[PDB]
Structure 1
Amino acid sequence: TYHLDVVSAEQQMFSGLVEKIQVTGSEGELGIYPGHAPLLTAIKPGMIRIVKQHGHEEFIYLSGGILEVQPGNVTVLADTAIRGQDLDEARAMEAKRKAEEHISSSHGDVDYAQASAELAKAIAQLRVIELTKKAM
């Protein structure tokens, strides 16, 4: 067996002990057994098969990433969303448009909205200073 990590930029996805794995590297399918020579490659979006020692089989879907294997260790730096020449350029185009305009969105913190409006209304018009004789 060897140690396998499946790690995204956000959170970890797998950290077990494995006996072999199978992936679709950019240049073709590819099977990693223990002791495999150090290797570096990109992997295409699709499934990957893990077999945990004692032979337990499971399938993890990856949106792509980079597979790097070492003596007795291996890691899959998985992508969190599909990546591509066109998709990333569309996202950059929208990110540019939103800046050439002055269009901005609303954060989803309804709790902060509630508390902020309540505090804005409670603090409003209460003429405390000049009621208490506090100079400051």
Structure 2
Amino acid sequence: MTLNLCVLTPNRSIWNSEVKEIILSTNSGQIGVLPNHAPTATAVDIGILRIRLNDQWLTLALMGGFARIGNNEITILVNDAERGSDIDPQEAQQTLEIAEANLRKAEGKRQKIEANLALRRARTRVEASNT
């Protein structure tokens, strides 16, 4: 009747209730899934997912990994994922500000890589919080 979704983190299976649509980011930039999709495997970029089942569609920001989608089924391997409602927006925004400030200072070949990937991490947290 529909495709089914299991998103899972290295310690914790987050979303294993099943849905009519999701739409997720990727390194190509954007993709959408609807039921009886052809078998595809996408490396998913860090940044928000949007999932629609029935009435309600909500975004949980998730931190990148892999997403294969088989027959009647999606499974998404992400190293960290949070529901966008469960993060309180303002605190996430504050964290983003801190990350930006540290990035602006942060210097040197590894360190910026860390700063840049941390600010990329922080910026997507509010984008699920607002949405």
Specify the TM-score bucket, using the shorter chain as the normaliser: 0.5 to 0.7
TM-score by length of 2: 0.59
Partner of 1:51: 52
Q: Any idea what the Cα deviations from partners look like across 1:7-50, whole Å, max 9, x if unmatched?
A: 01110110111111111111120000001100111111111011
| TM alignment of 1:81-100, pairs within 5 A | 86=110
TM-score by length of 1: 0.57
Partner of 1:2: 3
Higher RCO (CA-CA < 8 Å; seq separation 6+): 2
Deviation at 1:58, TM superposition (A): 1.1
Q: Any idea what the Cα deviations from partners look like across 1:56-102, whole Å, max 9, x if unmatched?
A: 21111101110110010101101128xxxx58x97xxxxxxxxxxxx
| Count of paired positions | 84
Q: Secondary structure at the residue paired with 1:69?
A: strand
CA RMSD after TM alignment: 2.0
Partner of 2:63: 63
Partner of 2:22: 21
The structure with more helix, counted as a fraction of residues: 2
Structure ID, larger Rg: 1
| TM alignment of 1:87-126, pairs within 5 A | none
Distance (Å, rounded) in 1 between the aligned partners of 2:80 and 2:10: 7
Identity rate, percent: 26
Structure 1 unmatched runs, 5+ = 91-136
Structure 2 unmatched runs, 5+ = 82-109, 115-131
Q: Secondary structure at the residue paired with 1:74?
A: strand
